[PDB]
Amino acid sequence: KETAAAKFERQHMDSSTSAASSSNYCNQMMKSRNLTKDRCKPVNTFVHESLADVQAVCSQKNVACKNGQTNCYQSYSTMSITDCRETGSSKYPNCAYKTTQANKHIIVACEGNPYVPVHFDASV
Ligand SMILES: [Cl-]
Ligand SMILES: [Cl-]
């Protein structure tokens, strides 16, 4: 009951802000995107660009994925992103995250028809 594309959108897209506000962005977004349900998702990145700009990456620079697959693509430009990672004080169900805002290239795995992002691999 979620497509790979839709799961990618939910976990990784935050086009409604230009950049993480505040230290509490990650606590709020990890909860609101339902990434804290039965466990605290340990690590997650949100991208502050339009969905079209992110989708476009699937036609940009083809690079290997960490896992050796060959359907990864690296954004030609940097993009506003926020990395969310659990802190030592995080104990499910009181999940706690460090918010780190940055401008980096993103690397995504793409697939399907239409050929769209299905996994966030990394930022550089
Ligand atoms: Cl979909
Ligand atoms: Cl991630």
mmCIF file of N, CA and C and ligand atoms in Angstrom:
data_model
loop_
_atom_site.group_PDB
_atom_site.id
_atom_site.type_symbol
_atom_site.label_atom_id
_atom_site.label_comp_id
_atom_site.label_asym_id
_atom_site.label_seq_id
_atom_site.Cartn_x
_atom_site.Cartn_y
_atom_site.Cartn_z
ATOM 1 N N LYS A 1 0.799 -1.230 0.000
ATOM 2 C CA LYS A 1 0.000 0.000 0.000
ATOM 3 C C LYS A 1 0.849 1.307 0.000
ATOM 4 N N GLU A 2 2.143 1.244 -0.385
ATOM 5 C CA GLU A 2 2.813 2.461 -0.945
ATOM 6 C C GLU A 2 3.732 2.094 -2.122
ATOM 7 N N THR A 3 3.621 2.761 -3.240
ATOM 8 C CA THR A 3 4.588 2.642 -4.344
ATOM 9 C C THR A 3 5.961 3.142 -3.906
ATOM 10 N N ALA A 4 6.989 2.609 -4.558
ATOM 11 C CA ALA A 4 8.373 3.032 -4.261
ATOM 12 C C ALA A 4 8.527 4.541 -4.474
ATOM 13 N N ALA A 5 7.947 5.088 -5.551
ATOM 14 C CA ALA A 5 7.960 6.537 -5.830
ATOM 15 C C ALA A 5 7.270 7.349 -4.760
ATOM 16 N N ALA A 6 6.065 6.915 -4.350
ATOM 17 C CA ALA A 6 5.364 7.609 -3.301
ATOM 18 C C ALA A 6 6.096 7.548 -1.949
ATOM 19 N N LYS A 7 6.760 6.418 -1.662
ATOM 20 C CA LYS A 7 7.494 6.322 -0.405
ATOM 21 C C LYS A 7 8.687 7.308 -0.409
ATOM 22 N N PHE A 8 9.364 7.400 -1.557
ATOM 23 C CA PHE A 8 10.445 8.341 -1.721
ATOM 24 C C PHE A 8 9.950 9.787 -1.465
ATOM 25 N N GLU A 9 8.815 10.151 -2.072
ATOM 26 C CA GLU A 9 8.270 11.496 -1.865
ATOM 27 C C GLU A 9 8.032 11.779 -0.387
ATOM 28 N N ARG A 10 7.340 10.858 0.252
ATOM 29 C CA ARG A 10 6.964 11.044 1.674
ATOM 30 C C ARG A 10 8.202 11.179 2.614
ATOM 31 N N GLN A 11 9.189 10.311 2.420
ATOM 32 C CA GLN A 11 10.392 10.314 3.251
ATOM 33 C C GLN A 11 11.304 11.477 2.899
ATOM 34 N N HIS A 12 11.382 11.869 1.618
ATOM 35 C CA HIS A 12 12.450 12.731 1.220
ATOM 36 C C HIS A 12 12.112 14.123 0.654
ATOM 37 N N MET A 13 10.859 14.411 0.337
ATOM 38 C CA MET A 13 10.526 15.707 -0.251
ATOM 39 C C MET A 13 10.019 16.721 0.803
ATOM 40 N N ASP A 14 10.646 17.903 0.871
ATOM 41 C CA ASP A 14 10.059 19.020 1.633
ATOM 42 C C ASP A 14 10.217 20.291 0.922
ATOM 43 N N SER A 15 9.412 20.470 -0.129
ATOM 44 C CA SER A 15 9.495 21.623 -0.993
ATOM 45 C C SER A 15 8.884 22.916 -0.373
ATOM 46 N N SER A 16 8.120 22.810 0.703
ATOM 47 C CA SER A 16 7.349 23.953 1.257
ATOM 48 C C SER A 16 8.253 24.920 2.062
ATOM 49 N N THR A 17 9.458 24.491 2.395
ATOM 50 C CA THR A 17 10.444 25.401 2.935
ATOM 51 C C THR A 17 11.728 25.394 2.124
ATOM 52 N N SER A 18 12.337 26.570 2.082
ATOM 53 C CA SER A 18 13.681 26.741 1.515
ATOM 54 C C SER A 18 14.860 26.036 2.291
ATOM 55 N N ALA A 19 14.725 25.871 3.597
ATOM 56 C CA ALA A 19 15.821 25.423 4.481
ATOM 57 C C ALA A 19 15.228 25.200 5.868
ATOM 58 N N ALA A 20 15.727 24.182 6.584
ATOM 59 C CA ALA A 20 15.402 23.924 7.970
ATOM 60 C C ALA A 20 15.554 25.186 8.801
ATOM 61 N N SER A 21 14.393 25.768 9.069
ATOM 62 C CA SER A 21 14.083 26.658 10.186
ATOM 63 C C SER A 21 15.009 26.688 11.455
ATOM 64 N N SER A 22 15.032 25.551 12.145
ATOM 65 C CA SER A 22 15.277 25.507 13.559
ATOM 66 C C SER A 22 15.804 24.161 13.948
ATOM 67 N N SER A 23 16.339 24.035 15.172
ATOM 68 C CA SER A 23 16.852 22.742 15.661
ATOM 69 C C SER A 23 15.765 21.671 15.766
ATOM 70 N N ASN A 24 14.482 22.080 15.783
ATOM 71 C CA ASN A 24 13.392 21.152 15.968
ATOM 72 C C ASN A 24 12.711 20.671 14.693
ATOM 73 N N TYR A 25 13.219 21.095 13.533
ATOM 74 C CA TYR A 25 12.674 20.727 12.256
ATOM 75 C C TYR A 25 12.606 19.201 12.152
ATOM 76 N N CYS A 26 13.716 18.502 12.457
ATOM 77 C CA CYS A 26 13.749 17.053 12.291
ATOM 78 C C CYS A 26 12.817 16.336 13.214
ATOM 79 N N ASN A 27 12.754 16.726 14.489
ATOM 80 C CA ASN A 27 11.744 16.083 15.346
ATOM 81 C C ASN A 27 10.337 16.208 14.781
ATOM 82 N N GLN A 28 9.976 17.414 14.341
ATOM 83 C CA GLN A 28 8.674 17.636 13.787
ATOM 84 C C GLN A 28 8.410 16.882 12.479
ATOM 85 N N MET A 29 9.340 16.967 11.530
ATOM 86 C CA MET A 29 9.161 16.277 10.235
ATOM 87 C C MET A 29 9.243 14.758 10.326
ATOM 88 N N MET A 30 10.096 14.216 11.183
ATOM 89 C CA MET A 30 10.192 12.748 11.239
ATOM 90 C C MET A 30 8.877 12.194 11.778
ATOM 91 N N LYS A 31 8.283 12.927 12.705
ATOM 92 C CA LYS A 31 6.973 12.529 13.243
ATOM 93 C C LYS A 31 5.857 12.706 12.231
ATOM 94 N N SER A 32 5.780 13.892 11.620
ATOM 95 C CA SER A 32 4.688 14.228 10.693
ATOM 96 C C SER A 32 4.719 13.352 9.420
ATOM 97 N N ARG A 33 5.910 12.878 9.016
ATOM 98 C CA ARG A 33 6.013 12.037 7.827
ATOM 99 C C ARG A 33 5.920 10.580 8.193
ATOM 100 N N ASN A 34 5.539 10.293 9.452
ATOM 101 C CA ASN A 34 5.323 8.965 9.920
ATOM 102 C C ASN A 34 6.548 8.053 9.882
ATOM 103 N N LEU A 35 7.720 8.640 10.156
ATOM 104 C CA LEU A 35 8.950 7.876 10.195
ATOM 105 C C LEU A 35 9.335 7.481 11.599
ATOM 106 N N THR A 36 8.446 7.715 12.570
ATOM 107 C CA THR A 36 8.704 7.376 13.981
ATOM 108 C C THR A 36 7.655 6.392 14.572
ATOM 109 N N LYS A 37 7.077 5.577 13.712
ATOM 110 C CA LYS A 37 5.898 4.773 14.075
ATOM 111 C C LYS A 37 6.122 3.617 14.994
ATOM 112 N N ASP A 38 6.903 2.637 14.592
ATOM 113 C CA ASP A 38 7.197 1.507 15.494
ATOM 114 C C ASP A 38 8.617 1.576 15.989
ATOM 115 N N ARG A 39 9.408 2.360 15.256
ATOM 116 C CA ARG A 39 10.732 2.698 15.676
ATOM 117 C C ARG A 39 11.106 4.076 15.162
ATOM 118 N N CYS A 40 12.194 4.584 15.726
ATOM 119 C CA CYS A 40 12.807 5.813 15.252
ATOM 120 C C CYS A 40 13.637 5.467 14.039
ATOM 121 N N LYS A 41 13.237 5.984 12.896
ATOM 122 C CA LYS A 41 14.066 5.810 11.712
ATOM 123 C C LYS A 41 15.403 6.511 12.000
ATOM 124 N N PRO A 42 16.555 5.809 11.830
ATOM 125 C CA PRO A 42 17.780 6.393 12.444
ATOM 126 C C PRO A 42 18.261 7.599 11.679
ATOM 127 N N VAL A 43 18.209 7.513 10.369
ATOM 128 C CA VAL A 43 18.764 8.557 9.493
ATOM 129 C C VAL A 43 17.790 8.847 8.338
ATOM 130 N N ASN A 44 17.575 10.122 8.021
ATOM 131 C CA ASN A 44 16.717 10.493 6.899
ATOM 132 C C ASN A 44 16.997 11.905 6.384
ATOM 133 N N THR A 45 17.042 12.063 5.067
ATOM 134 C CA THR A 45 17.288 13.331 4.450
ATOM 135 C C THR A 45 16.042 13.861 3.721
ATOM 136 N N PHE A 46 15.781 15.148 3.931
ATOM 137 C CA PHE A 46 14.745 15.894 3.246
ATOM 138 C C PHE A 46 15.340 16.903 2.277
ATOM 139 N N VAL A 47 14.731 16.999 1.086
ATOM 140 C CA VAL A 47 15.236 17.855 0.047
ATOM 141 C C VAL A 47 14.290 19.053 -0.099
ATOM 142 N N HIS A 48 14.851 20.258 -0.070
ATOM 143 C CA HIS A 48 14.101 21.527 -0.169
ATOM 144 C C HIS A 48 14.146 22.077 -1.558
ATOM 145 N N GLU A 49 13.621 21.294 -2.497
ATOM 146 C CA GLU A 49 13.537 21.703 -3.917
ATOM 147 C C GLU A 49 12.154 21.219 -4.420
ATOM 148 N N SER A 50 11.734 21.697 -5.581
ATOM 149 C CA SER A 50 10.473 21.224 -6.149
ATOM 150 C C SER A 50 10.624 19.716 -6.421
ATOM 151 N N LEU A 51 9.485 19.011 -6.399
ATOM 152 C CA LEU A 51 9.445 17.673 -6.850
ATOM 153 C C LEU A 51 9.918 17.550 -8.277
ATOM 154 N N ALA A 52 9.511 18.466 -9.163
ATOM 155 C CA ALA A 52 10.056 18.405 -10.563
ATOM 156 C C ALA A 52 11.604 18.469 -10.632
ATOM 157 N N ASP A 53 12.209 19.341 -9.826
ATOM 158 C CA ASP A 53 13.700 19.449 -9.804
ATOM 159 C C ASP A 53 14.368 18.168 -9.323
ATOM 160 N N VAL A 54 13.745 17.517 -8.364
ATOM 161 C CA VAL A 54 14.256 16.244 -7.865
ATOM 162 C C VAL A 54 14.032 15.094 -8.863
ATOM 163 N N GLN A 55 12.822 15.029 -9.420
ATOM 164 C CA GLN A 55 12.525 14.078 -10.463
ATOM 165 C C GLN A 55 13.534 14.184 -11.620
ATOM 166 N N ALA A 56 13.906 15.430 -11.951
ATOM 167 C CA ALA A 56 14.847 15.723 -13.073
ATOM 168 C C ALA A 56 16.194 15.092 -12.887
ATOM 169 N N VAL A 57 16.556 14.798 -11.649
ATOM 170 C CA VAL A 57 17.859 14.204 -11.380
ATOM 171 C C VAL A 57 17.985 12.864 -12.106
ATOM 172 N N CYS A 58 16.867 12.144 -12.313
ATOM 173 C CA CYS A 58 16.906 10.831 -13.010
ATOM 174 C C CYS A 58 17.387 10.908 -14.454
ATOM 175 N N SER A 59 17.566 12.099 -14.976
ATOM 176 C CA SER A 59 18.140 12.276 -16.314
ATOM 177 C C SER A 59 19.488 13.019 -16.326
ATOM 178 N N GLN A 60 20.136 13.131 -15.153
ATOM 179 C CA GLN A 60 21.354 13.936 -14.932
ATOM 180 C C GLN A 60 22.530 12.962 -14.889
ATOM 181 N N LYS A 61 23.490 13.109 -13.973
ATOM 182 C CA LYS A 61 24.725 12.332 -14.089
ATOM 183 C C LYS A 61 24.567 10.927 -13.510
ATOM 184 N N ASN A 62 24.740 9.933 -14.341
ATOM 185 C CA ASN A 62 24.628 8.560 -13.947
ATOM 186 C C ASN A 62 25.923 8.122 -13.243
ATOM 187 N N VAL A 63 25.742 7.694 -11.990
ATOM 188 C CA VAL A 63 26.800 7.253 -11.081
ATOM 189 C C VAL A 63 26.378 5.923 -10.441
ATOM 190 N N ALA A 64 27.356 5.163 -9.938
ATOM 191 C CA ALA A 64 27.043 3.968 -9.105
ATOM 192 C C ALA A 64 26.374 4.349 -7.801
ATOM 193 N N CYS A 65 25.499 3.454 -7.365
ATOM 194 C CA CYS A 65 24.888 3.517 -6.059
ATOM 195 C C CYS A 65 25.847 2.834 -5.051
ATOM 196 N N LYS A 66 25.747 3.191 -3.753
ATOM 197 C CA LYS A 66 26.625 2.595 -2.687
ATOM 198 C C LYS A 66 26.641 1.104 -2.815
ATOM 199 N N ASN A 67 25.492 0.548 -3.120
ATOM 200 C CA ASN A 67 25.288 -0.874 -3.199
ATOM 201 C C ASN A 67 25.704 -1.504 -4.521
ATOM 202 N N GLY A 68 26.345 -0.747 -5.418
ATOM 203 C CA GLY A 68 26.855 -1.364 -6.654
ATOM 204 C C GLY A 68 25.898 -1.322 -7.838
ATOM 205 N N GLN A 69 24.625 -1.021 -7.604
ATOM 206 C CA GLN A 69 23.720 -0.819 -8.734
ATOM 207 C C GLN A 69 24.114 0.423 -9.572
ATOM 208 N N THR A 70 23.607 0.432 -10.792
ATOM 209 C CA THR A 70 24.013 1.411 -11.789
ATOM 210 C C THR A 70 22.893 2.361 -12.204
ATOM 211 N N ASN A 71 21.790 2.377 -11.440
ATOM 212 C CA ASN A 71 20.636 3.248 -11.712
ATOM 213 C C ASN A 71 20.581 4.445 -10.743
ATOM 214 N N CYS A 72 21.751 4.961 -10.330
ATOM 215 C CA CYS A 72 21.858 6.177 -9.491
ATOM 216 C C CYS A 72 22.329 7.357 -10.324
ATOM 217 N N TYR A 73 21.944 8.533 -9.870
ATOM 218 C CA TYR A 73 22.109 9.786 -10.589
ATOM 219 C C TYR A 73 22.419 10.842 -9.559
ATOM 220 N N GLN A 74 23.378 11.677 -9.907
ATOM 221 C CA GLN A 74 23.863 12.731 -9.077
ATOM 222 C C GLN A 74 23.439 14.074 -9.714
ATOM 223 N N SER A 75 22.797 14.907 -8.910
ATOM 224 C CA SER A 75 22.288 16.224 -9.331
ATOM 225 C C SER A 75 23.466 17.031 -9.784
ATOM 226 N N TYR A 76 23.307 17.691 -10.930
ATOM 227 C CA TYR A 76 24.342 18.596 -11.428
ATOM 228 C C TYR A 76 24.557 19.798 -10.503
ATOM 229 N N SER A 77 23.489 20.337 -9.886
ATOM 230 C CA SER A 77 23.633 21.447 -8.966
ATOM 231 C C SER A 77 23.522 20.892 -7.531
ATOM 232 N N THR A 78 23.939 21.713 -6.586
ATOM 233 C CA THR A 78 23.642 21.453 -5.196
ATOM 234 C C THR A 78 22.160 21.845 -4.978
ATOM 235 N N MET A 79 21.596 21.294 -3.936
ATOM 236 C CA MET A 79 20.226 21.487 -3.512
ATOM 237 C C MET A 79 20.207 21.707 -2.015
ATOM 238 N N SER A 80 19.262 22.504 -1.540
ATOM 239 C CA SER A 80 19.056 22.662 -0.100
ATOM 240 C C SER A 80 18.539 21.358 0.463
ATOM 241 N N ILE A 81 19.215 20.811 1.478
ATOM 242 C CA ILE A 81 18.752 19.579 2.118
ATOM 243 C C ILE A 81 18.818 19.708 3.621
ATOM 244 N N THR A 82 18.078 18.875 4.329
ATOM 245 C CA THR A 82 18.266 18.759 5.766
ATOM 246 C C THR A 82 18.468 17.262 6.086
ATOM 247 N N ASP A 83 19.604 16.955 6.702
ATOM 248 C CA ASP A 83 19.816 15.640 7.305
ATOM 249 C C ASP A 83 19.282 15.552 8.741
ATOM 250 N N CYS A 84 18.546 14.454 8.992
ATOM 251 C CA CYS A 84 17.941 14.126 10.315
ATOM 252 C C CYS A 84 18.527 12.837 10.817
ATOM 253 N N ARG A 85 19.195 12.878 11.966
ATOM 254 C CA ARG A 85 19.847 11.700 12.537
ATOM 255 C C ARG A 85 19.528 11.627 14.022
ATOM 256 N N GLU A 86 19.250 10.453 14.549
ATOM 257 C CA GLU A 86 18.928 10.331 15.959
ATOM 258 C C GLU A 86 20.109 10.722 16.790
ATOM 259 N N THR A 87 19.829 11.349 17.922
ATOM 260 C CA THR A 87 20.813 11.686 18.984
ATOM 261 C C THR A 87 20.853 10.581 20.044
ATOM 262 N N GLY A 88 21.850 10.616 20.953
ATOM 263 C CA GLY A 88 21.992 9.565 21.997
ATOM 264 C C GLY A 88 20.819 9.584 22.966
ATOM 265 N N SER A 89 20.329 10.786 23.264
ATOM 266 C CA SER A 89 19.075 10.959 24.038
ATOM 267 C C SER A 89 17.728 10.401 23.412
ATOM 268 N N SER A 90 17.776 9.855 22.182
ATOM 269 C CA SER A 90 16.585 9.342 21.477
ATOM 270 C C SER A 90 16.264 7.949 21.937
ATOM 271 N N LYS A 91 15.060 7.734 22.471
ATOM 272 C CA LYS A 91 14.623 6.372 22.874
ATOM 273 C C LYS A 91 13.198 6.229 22.387
ATOM 274 N N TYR A 92 12.997 5.277 21.481
ATOM 275 C CA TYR A 92 11.664 5.073 20.951
ATOM 276 C C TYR A 92 10.756 4.844 22.152
ATOM 277 N N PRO A 93 9.621 5.546 22.247
ATOM 278 C CA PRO A 93 8.844 6.380 21.332
ATOM 279 C C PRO A 93 9.039 7.879 21.492
ATOM 280 N N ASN A 94 10.013 8.283 22.291
ATOM 281 C CA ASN A 94 10.409 9.676 22.341
ATOM 282 C C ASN A 94 11.641 9.848 21.454
ATOM 283 N N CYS A 95 11.409 9.815 20.146
ATOM 284 C CA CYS A 95 12.514 9.941 19.151
ATOM 285 C C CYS A 95 13.105 11.359 19.243
ATOM 286 N N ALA A 96 14.441 11.451 19.104
ATOM 287 C CA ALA A 96 15.131 12.754 19.121
ATOM 288 C C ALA A 96 16.177 12.841 17.993
ATOM 289 N N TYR A 97 16.159 13.959 17.277
ATOM 290 C CA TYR A 97 16.973 14.114 16.063
ATOM 291 C C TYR A 97 17.727 15.417 16.128
ATOM 292 N N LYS A 98 18.972 15.315 15.712
ATOM 293 C CA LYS A 98 19.785 16.426 15.179
ATOM 294 C C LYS A 98 19.409 16.855 13.744
ATOM 295 N N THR A 99 19.238 18.150 13.576
ATOM 296 C CA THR A 99 18.898 18.746 12.313
ATOM 297 C C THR A 99 20.149 19.391 11.744
ATOM 298 N N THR A 100 20.598 18.925 10.560
ATOM 299 C CA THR A 100 21.705 19.556 9.878
ATOM 300 C C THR A 100 21.273 19.990 8.468
ATOM 301 N N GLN A 101 21.265 21.297 8.263
ATOM 302 C CA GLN A 101 20.892 21.928 6.978
ATOM 303 C C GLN A 101 22.135 22.159 6.166
ATOM 304 N N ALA A 102 22.076 21.894 4.860
ATOM 305 C CA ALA A 102 23.229 21.985 4.017
ATOM 306 C C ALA A 102 22.802 22.172 2.561
ATOM 307 N N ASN A 103 23.746 22.607 1.712
ATOM 308 C CA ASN A 103 23.581 22.551 0.215
ATOM 309 C C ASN A 103 24.545 21.569 -0.424
ATOM 310 N N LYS A 104 24.020 20.512 -0.977
ATOM 311 C CA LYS A 104 24.817 19.428 -1.467
ATOM 312 C C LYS A 104 24.101 18.923 -2.707
ATOM 313 N N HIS A 105 24.880 18.262 -3.562
ATOM 314 C CA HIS A 105 24.343 17.406 -4.598
ATOM 315 C C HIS A 105 23.659 16.243 -3.964
ATOM 316 N N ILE A 106 22.592 15.768 -4.591
ATOM 317 C CA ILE A 106 21.908 14.593 -4.090
ATOM 318 C C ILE A 106 22.162 13.461 -5.073
ATOM 319 N N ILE A 107 22.134 12.232 -4.542
ATOM 320 C CA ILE A 107 22.251 11.029 -5.328
ATOM 321 C C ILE A 107 21.016 10.179 -5.061
ATOM 322 N N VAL A 108 20.271 9.873 -6.096
ATOM 323 C CA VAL A 108 19.074 9.055 -6.007
ATOM 324 C C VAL A 108 19.113 7.896 -6.984
ATOM 325 N N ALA A 109 18.413 6.815 -6.629
ATOM 326 C CA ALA A 109 18.199 5.674 -7.510
ATOM 327 C C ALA A 109 16.865 5.913 -8.173
ATOM 328 N N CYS A 110 16.819 5.632 -9.464
ATOM 329 C CA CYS A 110 15.608 5.855 -10.218
ATOM 330 C C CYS A 110 15.138 4.595 -10.852
ATOM 331 N N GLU A 111 13.820 4.527 -10.978
ATOM 332 C CA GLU A 111 13.264 3.450 -11.724
ATOM 333 C C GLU A 111 11.837 3.621 -12.068
ATOM 334 N N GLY A 112 11.432 2.782 -13.002
ATOM 335 C CA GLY A 112 10.042 2.720 -13.459
ATOM 336 C C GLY A 112 9.747 3.423 -14.764
ATOM 337 N N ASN A 113 8.453 3.473 -15.041
ATOM 338 C CA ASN A 113 7.905 4.286 -16.119
ATOM 339 C C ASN A 113 6.672 5.017 -15.661
ATOM 340 N N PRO A 114 6.772 6.347 -15.429
ATOM 341 C CA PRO A 114 7.914 7.214 -15.656
ATOM 342 C C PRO A 114 9.136 6.889 -14.738
ATOM 343 N N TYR A 115 10.311 7.315 -15.175
ATOM 344 C CA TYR A 115 11.578 6.929 -14.508
ATOM 345 C C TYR A 115 11.866 7.959 -13.463
ATOM 346 N N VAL A 116 11.552 7.596 -12.229
ATOM 347 C CA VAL A 116 11.528 8.531 -11.090
ATOM 348 C C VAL A 116 12.292 8.021 -9.862
ATOM 349 N N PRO A 117 12.585 8.921 -8.893
ATOM 350 C CA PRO A 117 13.355 8.530 -7.746
ATOM 351 C C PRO A 117 12.621 7.533 -6.869
ATOM 352 N N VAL A 118 13.347 6.462 -6.526
ATOM 353 C CA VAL A 118 12.853 5.429 -5.601
ATOM 354 C C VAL A 118 13.702 5.236 -4.347
ATOM 355 N N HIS A 119 14.903 5.840 -4.264
ATOM 356 C CA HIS A 119 15.758 5.654 -3.061
ATOM 357 C C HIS A 119 16.655 6.864 -3.032
ATOM 358 N N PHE A 120 16.864 7.415 -1.838
ATOM 359 C CA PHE A 120 17.864 8.404 -1.612
ATOM 360 C C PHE A 120 19.149 7.696 -1.236
ATOM 361 N N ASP A 121 20.209 7.814 -2.066
ATOM 362 C CA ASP A 121 21.450 7.077 -1.811
ATOM 363 C C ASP A 121 22.395 7.836 -0.891
ATOM 364 N N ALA A 122 22.572 9.123 -1.178
ATOM 365 C CA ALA A 122 23.557 9.980 -0.534
ATOM 366 C C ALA A 122 23.459 11.426 -1.022
ATOM 367 N N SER A 123 24.152 12.310 -0.287
ATOM 368 C CA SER A 123 24.402 13.703 -0.664
ATOM 369 C C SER A 123 25.919 13.882 -0.721
ATOM 370 N N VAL A 124 26.378 14.752 -1.597
ATOM 371 C CA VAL A 124 27.785 15.063 -1.665
ATOM 372 C C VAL A 124 27.853 16.557 -1.851
HETATM 373 CL CL CL B 1 3.373 6.753 -7.428
HETATM 374 CL CL CL B 2 18.191 9.226 3.856
#
